[PDB]
Structures are given as structure tokens and as C-alpha cells.
Design a protein around this ligand. Structure first.
Ligand SMILES: CC(C)=CC[C@@H](O)C1=CC(=O)c2c(O)ccc(O)c2C1=O
Lengths: 299, 299
């Protein structure tokens, strides 16, 4: 049974604050005596291109309002770093979890805490796609919503701050250093993301899960090695496949090698027509190897 | 766009405890000075039908261990209520949320906090199906994982305690009064659940959601009334559609009555023609009316 899940959100909920500047409202993340939020909060109300360097120089501390569960925090100073602000506040978050900052790469899964006016309203897992966007569920007010993973020892990795929705509906964020993923611009524009590629590492994990669930009508006995598959992948909307030995736990059971699965992918690439795999009508790239192993065996 | 989300889990994480009896270990829920957990924890280790009234009679309080974050609570007394135990402990949970207990009905959505040895590991939303099972992701140790909903006022409704995985992989739980949903037996046996029906109320919500995204190739211009659809639903594995009242918010913004959607369901009943609606190739009964409204409008 494969169910997309989120890791528990309680320790991140204690770090979400409401950040207001003039009339603009979004979410920030409060760690120690620092609040990080998108710099969109200081943007003037206008249609034209925003000049964030100008807005930053004309910024006044007293125009800020930062609160946690209605309790307001004093603003001491502010600095700009790419597309985020670092707001120093007059008290430390005593519920700051043990944490680090990590930048995500395409193929990485993580957790989104969807927040409105500094209040979490939902949590879900997502994958950073090859075009550096995610498929979230956001409405007006979710700017600054955090993305995170919890490591095995309980260290939270903060990796994402929601910034903007593109015209196609794809969602874009930044890391906590202020780099926008995919280097989109953090203001409204006509930018379009590149084509989505199917994450081959996730498709392999998916097919190993199908095998462990007695679903093997689709198995090919042909073998395609990694170099060959990677060459085919370029021609057909798939990423290269990373490695084989990560899957050797899965190849010892099932008895099927990664190269048989790679051959299977090339065979199923058209579609399953008249059949499904684990209830899916086409190849699923939603789940990582880590997810499959964790949800199946608790590792 | 429609994504299955959970409500944040922080307030429920602080209620989850590790209940041990002899060598048997599972999860419990600590509210005030009561821990509620499945009665399987006092089952003897055996491959025969378990007589729970006898196990309850031979029970000894000193055999229990109840802990939170490796901190042990004193057990004061235990009573049995259907498939659950209520363990009184000598400490009250100081983080007990404002809460009620609620029994789910088929078609209700809720949140699962999946737990192992008293520690939350994942959170996901699910839907109670017509055969009173859910499709979750649980492995050994998950029993006693709680399901919940959070109301507008912040009241947590506790509605589910995970009990058992069936032969088909479907999951069975009880409410906090001890009744097993669907009256399955809370122990190993060969029980098979009756087949599932399509929740028409949810399918209608999902088609309104598609209309709000411009996906409307599927729209029938014709109409069927409620009585005709329900007669059709009986003979095709669909639930009866409720009323047309609830969909006022959606019928108003779409200008599409429920009767047109019921007609569209009959047409789309078999086959989308290879085509697609919001990422699905067949109709979807996983989203309720309330979920669609909250995700499109925040209400
Ligand atoms: C004792 C016998 C040899 C097998 C028991 C196993 O099947 C089982 C494990 C379990 O952990 C559990 C619960 O936690 C809750 C209800 C429930 O029936 C169960 C179970 O039947």
C-alpha cells in the first residue's frame, strides 16, 4: 500500500508567524531571534516592475508587524538576502527545533505546511520536479509557507518558502538563503517553466513496490543497461536513472534486477491500455525509494 | 487543482503514548487522565480465537507500562468498552486539546496520524468508504493510531483508533466508544468486507471542482433528476445522491445544476475515452464537498 504522506508538522507549526508590512500580509518562519519571510512583504502596491532595492532603502522598521498566535514581536532590524528578508526580533523562539537549512535538488521529496495569516491549515508531501516547481494546493495568502523534512535523528531540514504561482498553476519557492528554485523572478511576470520530466528513480521504486504487492503482469524479461536507458530517457521525457545498488535490497527479494525494470519502463512508456499497476493507469513517479522502503518495512 | 491534504497534526501528536502489556506494544491516546487504546494489547500470544472477557479477567495492572517521551505514567485502573480499553493514569495530559468524540459515517473524510511505539511518523487524509474500511498505509506497530478532524473553533474531533488490516489490505478501526466501524472482529480471522460503492456526493463535488478549473469537456447538456439517478445508482454500484441544497455555493459559481452532473456521471460511468479530468482517468470519490470548498475558497 502506497500512500503519499507528510511527516508530522507540530514542531514546524510552532515556528510559523504572521508578517505584516503596511497592508501586506504573509507567513514567516521564526527560529531563534530571526524571522525569514519572502521580501514580497515590502513590495509597493503597483502594476509596474518592482524595484526591490528601492523598496528596501525606503523601508521603515515601524511599518512591520510580526505575531505568533496573536502575540506580537518587536522588530529590531532587517536585512535582505536574495528573495527573502531576515527580520531580527526582540525575543527568541523558545520552541525552536534542532534544525539546519538544505537546498533541494530535483527528485527530492519534502513536506509543505500550507499557512494563511501565520496559521497552518494543511500539510502534504510533494516532490521537487525537474523544472524546479511543485504541484501544491495554495490559495491567496500562502506566500511564505514553509517546506521541510525531518531527518532520522529529529533534525528539521528547512528547505522551501513559498513565493509565487505561475500562469500554468505551477508553484515556485525559494530556499532560506533567498535563492529562488529554478531562478524564476519573485514578482508577477510572463515566465513559463520548462517541461516536466518523469523522475525515473521514482518509477523504478514504484515498479519494485508493484512487485512486492504481487503485481507483475507488466514485467519484461529484456534487459536495458543504465547507459542505454539514459540515452532512451533523453528521447522520451524521462530523467536518467541514478544508480542500481541502492535497490539491491529490493532486487534480492522479488528476484528482479534494475535493468529488467528499465526495460519494463521502455515497454510501458506508451500506457498500460486495459490494465493497471497498483490501481494506476500509467507509470507513477510520485514515490521515492526511501518512501517505498519506509512505508513497506519501516526502514 | 485538487490535492489530498491532512490537517496539521501538532495538537494530536502531544496526545500519543506508548502502551505496553507484557511484550505486546501499541499506541494509545492520552486525554485528561485517560489513555484509550485497542484491547488487543492484553491479548495472549496464541493462534486460536482470543477470548477477551477471559483476558480482561486475568488482567494485572502491574503488567501495564504507559509512557510518553520515555516518561512513565502511573496506571490506576482499566475498564474494557467494546474493542478498546480506558486506562486511568495518575497524571493528566497538560496538552489535552479542546476535543469531542465523534462517530464517522461513510463518505466522511478525516486525518490519520500513523504512530509506532507511541511516536507519530506520518499524517494523511483518508475517506471512510461504504464498507466501513479505509485505504491507509500501516505496517506492524500502527495499531491504536488515531484519526481526527479539527473544527473551525479549534475543537479536535477524535473519531478513529486503528485496529486491524484485513486480508485485502483494507484497514479497520473503531471509534472512541469501542464500536468497530462495520462491526468487523478485532482479531485475526478470514473476514472479507463487502464490495465498495462509489460515493456519489463526492463525485459531484469532484466535478464541481473540475468546472472551477475550466475542465468541462465532459459536461452533459442534459439532466437527470435525483429519483432517476438514485434508481440508476442502485443498479450500477453508486450511492444515492443526497439533496441539491448543499451544492448551492458550487451551483451558484458554476451555473451548473447537480442534475447536469448526475447526467454526466451516467455518461462518464464507463470510460473517459482516453481523456482525463484533473489528473484522473476515471471518476473520483475521494474529495467531499467541504474539502473542495476549503481548497478553492478557504471557507
Ligand atoms: C495474537 C495473534 C498471534 C495475532 C495477532 C495479530 O493479528 C494482531 C496484532 C495486532 O497488533 C492487533 C492489534 O494491534 C489490534 C487488533 C488486532 O486484532 C491485532 C491483531 O489481531
Amino acid at each position: 500500500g502506497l500512500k503519499k504522506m507528510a511527516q508530522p508538522s507540530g514542531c514546524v507549526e510552532r515556528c510559523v508567524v504572521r508578517v505584516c508590512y503596511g497592508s501586506t500580509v504573509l507567513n514567516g518562519v521564526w527560529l531563534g531571534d530571526t524571522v525569514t519571510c519572502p521580501r514580497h512583504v515590502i513590495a509597493p502596491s503597483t502594476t509596474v516592475l518592482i524595484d526591490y532595492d528601492h523598496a528596501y532603502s525606503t523601508m521603515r522598521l515601524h511599518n512591520f508587524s510580526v505575531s505568533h498566535n496573536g502575540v506580537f514581536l518587536g522588530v529590531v532590524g532587517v536585512t535582505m538576502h536574495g528573495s527573502v528578508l531576515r527580520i531580527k526580533v526582540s525575543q527568541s523562539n523558545v520552541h525552536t527545533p534542532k534544525h539546519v537549512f538544505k537546498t533541494l535538488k530535483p527528485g527530492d521529496s519534502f513536506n509543505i505546511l500550507a499557512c494563511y495569516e501565520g496559521i497552518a491549515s494543511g500539510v502534504f508531501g510533494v516532490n521537487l520536479r525537474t523544472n524546479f516547481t511543485i504541484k501544491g494546493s495554495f490559495i491567496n495568502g500562502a506566500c511564505g509557507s514553509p517546506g521541510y523534512n525531518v531527518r532520522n535523528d529529529g533534525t528539521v531540514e528547512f528547505c522551501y518558502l513559498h513565493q509565487i504561482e505561475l500562469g500554468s498553476g505551477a508553484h515556485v519557492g525559494s530556499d532560506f538563503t533567498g535563492s529562488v528554485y529554478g531562478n524564476f523572478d519573485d514578482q508577477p511576470s510572463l515566465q513559463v517553466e520548462s517541461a516536466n520530466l518523469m523522475l525515473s528513480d521514482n518509477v523504478v521504486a514504484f515498479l519494485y513496490a508493484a512487485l512486492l504487492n504481487g503485481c507483475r503482469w507488466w514485467l519484461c524479461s529484456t534487459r536495458v543497461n543504465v547507459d542505454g536507458f539514459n540515452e532512451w530517457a533523453m528521447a522520451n521525457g524521462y530523467t536518467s536513472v541514478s544508480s542500481v545498488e541502492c535497490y539491491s535490497i529490493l532486487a534480492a527479494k522479488t528476484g528482479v534486477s534494475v535493468e529488467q525494470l528499465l526495460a519494463s519502463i521502455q515497454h510501458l512508456h506508451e500506457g498500460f491500455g486495459g490494465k493497471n499497476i497498483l490501481g494506476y493507469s500509467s507509470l507513477c513517479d510520485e514515490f521515492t525509494l526511501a518512501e517505498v522502503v519506509k512505508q513497506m518495512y519501516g526502514v
